[PDB]
Amino acid sequence: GCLGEGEKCADWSGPSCCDGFYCSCRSMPYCRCRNNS
Fold it and tell me: According to its record, what is known about the domains?
């Protein structure tokens, strides 16, 4: 399952971000969603 909508990503369930928005964690320490424009 994805990570809700406003729900910040995390290694807990693995970043992914539900539909309508993609997550951007990468190897960097900073991670967060990213809705499409």
Answer: The presence of a 'disulfide through disulfide knot' structurally defines this protein as a knottin.
**Technique used by the depositors:** NMR
CA 31 to chain centre: 7
Token pair, residue 24, equals 């951007």
Task: Scan for tokens 């992914």, then name that residue.
Answer: 16
Quote the DSSP letter at residue 2. Answer: -
| Rounded CA separation 37/10 (Å) | 23
| Number of structural domains in the chain | 1
Contact 6, 16 (CB under 8 A): no
Measured from the Cβ of residue 17, the count of other Cβ atoms closer than 10 Å reads: 23
**Tokens 């693995």 sit on residue:** 14
